Design a protein around this ligand. Sequence first.
Ligand SMILES: C=C1[C@H](O)CC(=C/C=C2\CCC[C@]3(C)[C@@H]([C@H](C)CCC[C@@H](O)c4ccc(O)cc4)CC[C@@H]23)C[C@H]1O
Lengths: 239, 10
Amino acid sequence: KLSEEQQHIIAILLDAHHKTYDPTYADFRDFRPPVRMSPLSMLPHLADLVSYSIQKVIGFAKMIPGFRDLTSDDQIVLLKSSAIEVIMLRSNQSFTMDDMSWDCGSQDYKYDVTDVSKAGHTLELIEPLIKFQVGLKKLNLHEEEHVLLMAICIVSPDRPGVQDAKLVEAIQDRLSNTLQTYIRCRHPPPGSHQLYAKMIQKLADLRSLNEEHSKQYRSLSFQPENSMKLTPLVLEVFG
Amino acid sequence: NHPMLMNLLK
Ligand SMILES: C=C1[C@H](O)CC(=C/C=C2\CCC[C@]3(C)[C@@H]([C@H](C)CCC[C@@H](O)c4ccc(O)cc4)CC[C@@H]23)C[C@H]1O
């Protein structure tokens, strides 16, 4: 049975997400205009989006039950390492299998392989990233399941530099158990089948995607011509 | 060493 405490967690995470995720995408107007023409032409616009998207992932993280208990240094570690992965997870909403792109309501804000390529990331990242989006889409998660996964991704005990791992591990265990119990009670078969395992496999895919991004991000960022075009927050969080 | 990240978490 799904406890009251467990049900409470889901209510909070759903709200948290609704406050941090705007399906209308109205704020993209604020970003530096996209350019599809031109090397790195998409970089300024996406750089802004990512920074915006980081800020929103931070706001989501804060509302996670038990996140506030951690030390700041631990708080910071978890965000720094999770941020890209959580962004990749969030983007599933905008992502459509119709044309393998992130569709944010308009051609200007619809993003494809080419646009990501124009932002200075290679296909070594993108093909496996796109494959992830398809595979996560294919799961057709309940919005309840989606928000829990993102939260589970942020509070991971094995992130490097975590002081108080046992607490981080306890916070996460509590969310895993909420997801696991949710799937049983509220996800009917056949969608239920192996669903928890398949979700954790996505965390595994994300670790790898994180790796590759870091690698490609260091290559972008070492050229100061490029670092100039990014936002200061993006510099802070990615390095 | 993370003024912005820290400030956003505060
Ligand atoms: C609000 C949201 C989500 O937060 C994110 C959205 C789309 C996400 C996309 C589609 C476009 C490409 C995105 C942003 C991926 C890139 C590879 C992240 C790289 C971050 C960073 O290294 C970087 C990005 C751009 C750049 O020019 C230089 C550096 C990660 C996820 C990819 C739209 C919408 O769903």
